[PDB]
């Protein structure tokens, strides 16, 4: 980044951390900082089953680490065509900096475009806790009829799910259960359509093909809606 952005990040750190300034003092200009190895982009043999590929993609995403600095290094315009977002995913791979939830979805798509038998689609959650609303997003995946997820989260059970769930409902309620364990109520689930595997595609991601109000719907109406959406992803 430039110098303005760079000095923005450190002044923003100066505010939010208790001893904001001494932290910059110790780190900026430091000669003995830990060299961080640049993560290797995962490449797959054709004999490797797709589930093992997904574990390798998720390991790479984790390897970048969650972005706690309070300054996001890769702006994501959700309306950009896919070929624009894939250029940006390529640059995350080359810059190799920490990331958050939205950036991991773009990375997950970039790294799974080589798997045409794997369906990818965004799943975003709106949860409530202690007077505040919270938004999170992962990349839903379907392989051989079973559902899973790639993502980046601050909690271990709000990102990676191996593709073992037999229906989309089970995948989403697993996420709801995980939210409930940390006292978040699931308010709304937004599911997008399958993302094209063409990294040069001029099409947008359809982030909001289905919006489900989990309380105004009710349990059984929530599940039938997720199954119609799964069916609609088999075009």
């Amino acid at each position: 980044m430039d110098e303005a952005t760079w000095e923005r990040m450190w002044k923003h750190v100066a505010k939010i951390h208790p001893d904001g300034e001494k932290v910059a003092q110790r780190i900026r200009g430091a000669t003995d900082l830990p060299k961080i190895p640049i993560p290797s982009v995962p490449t797959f043999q054709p004999s490797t089953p797709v589930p093992e590929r997904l574990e390798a993609v998720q390991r790479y995403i984790r390897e970048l680490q969650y972005n706690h600095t309070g300054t996001q290094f890769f702006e994501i315009k959700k309306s950009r065509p896919l070929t624009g977002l894939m250029d940006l995913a390529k640059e995350m791979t080359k810059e190799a900096l920490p990331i958050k939830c939205l950036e991991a979805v773009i990375l997950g798509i970039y790294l799974t475009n080589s798997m045409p038998t794997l369906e990818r689609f965004p799943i975003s959650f709106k949860t409530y806790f202690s007077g505040n609303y919270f938004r999170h997003i992962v990349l839903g995946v379907n392989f051989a009829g079973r559902y899973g997820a790639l993502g980046m989260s601050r909690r271990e059970d709000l990102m990676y799910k191996p593709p073992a769930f037999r229906t989309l409902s089970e995948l989403v309620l697993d996420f709801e259960a995980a939210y409930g364990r940390c006292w978040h109520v699931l308010k709304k689930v937004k599911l997008g359509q399958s993302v094209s595997h063409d990294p040069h595609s001029v099409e947008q991601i359809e982030w909001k093909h289905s919006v489900l109000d989990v309380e105004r719907l009710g349990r059984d109406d929530f599940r039938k809606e997720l199954e119609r959406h799964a069916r609609d992803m088999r075009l």
Binding site: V13, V23, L33, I36, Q65, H68, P98
Partner: peptide
């Protein structure tokens, strides 16, 4: 050329500090 090695050495320096900062911010929870 010599202009381009200065931009690779500036990005490597920033990355190191970004990850040192990320470590400090991660251990503030």
């Amino acid at each position: 050329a010599k202009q381009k090695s200065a931009q690779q050495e500036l990005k490597q320096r920033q990355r190191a500090e970004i990850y040192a900062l990320n470590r400090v911010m991660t251990e503030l929870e």
